[PDB]
Design a protein around this ligand. Structure first.
Ligand SMILES: CCOc1ccc2nc(S(N)(=O)=O)sc2c1
Ligand SMILES: [Zn+2]
Length: 257
């Protein structure tokens, strides 16, 4: 099965998922001098005050914090989007070293990790329908750099011991994702894809310009997770990022100049 190892990593994925070589794959390198300022772009509207987190899960390639998406509780609108997108989960990608880990890069610069808040377009009724549409998903991407600790992240860090191996889950209620946002909501946006299989080209990417800082101790605890299931040989969950893909016939737009 697919993963991030030498024998099943991103350069192998196209054999099972031919769309890996598609025309609107993610992630990409954001060239800040080629991105076009678009004054017609609206500010992002993040409404997370009623968010209901349920569970945190190690799924074998990352850990997901899952939300109740049966109503318009935590939604994303505005920006480049038409209509209302519901938050369903967030997860991270990170590296084995502080100098790598993000999926998107900015002028070829890598960050230590990247947070993805995944939302789906409510006009399609459920998430599985949404991923089959060109405007089905909106993923908010936030860069993590190593520096001062992020207080709002610590509740996530402290529960990781309980979901060390693949398939483990833990109740995770009353988590407020607003504690993970940067001060500014300026962004780049482009049409792209899921960055893990099935790599569907259904995503409007919204990548925030301002990174958040987390401490070395916080990111260190990410790196203690396991790709494997309990009772299997230990493989540390690190470097679960896909490298940048060709931009091809797309333009990256910026909400700011
Ligand atoms: C369709 C089964 O659920 C999936 C599969 C892949 C996938 N990739 C992302 S990401 N890394 O935010 O682009 S969210 C997501 C959800
Ligand atoms: Zn992701």
């Amino acid at each position: 099965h697919w993963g991030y190892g030498k024998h099943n990593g991103p350069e192998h994925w196209h054999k099972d998922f031919p769309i890996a070589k598609g025309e609107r794959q993610s992630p990409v390198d954001i060239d800040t001098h080629t991105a076009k300022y678009d004054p017609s772009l609206k500010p992002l509207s993040v409404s997370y005050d009623q968010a209901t987190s349920l569970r945190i899960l190690n799924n074998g390639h990352a850990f997901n914090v899952e939300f109740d998406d049966s109503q318009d509780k935590a939604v994303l609108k505005g920006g480049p989007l038409d209509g209302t997108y519901r938050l369903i989960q967030f997860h991270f990608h990170w590296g084995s070293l502080d100098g790598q880990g993000s999926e998107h890069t900015v002028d070829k610069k890598k960050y230590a990790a990247e947070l993805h808040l995944v939302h789906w377009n409510t006009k399609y009724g459920d998430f599985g329908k949404a991923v089959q549409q060109p405007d089905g998903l909106a993923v908010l991407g936030i860069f993590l750099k190593v520096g001062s600790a992020k207080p709002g992240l610590q509740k996530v860090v402290d529960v990781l011991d309980s979901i060390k191996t693949k398939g483990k889950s833990a109740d995770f209620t009353n988590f407020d994702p607003r504690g993970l946002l940067p001060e500014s909501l300026d962004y780049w946006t482009y049409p792209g894809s899921l960055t893990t299989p099935p790599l569907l080209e259904c995503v409007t990417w919204i990548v925030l310009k301002e990174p958040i800082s987390v401490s070395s101790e916080q990111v260190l605890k990410f790196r203690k997770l396991n790709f494997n299931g309990e009772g299997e040989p230990e493989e540390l969950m690190v470097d679960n990022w896909r490298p940048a893909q060709p931009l091809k016939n797309r333009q990256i737009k910026a909400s700011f100049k």
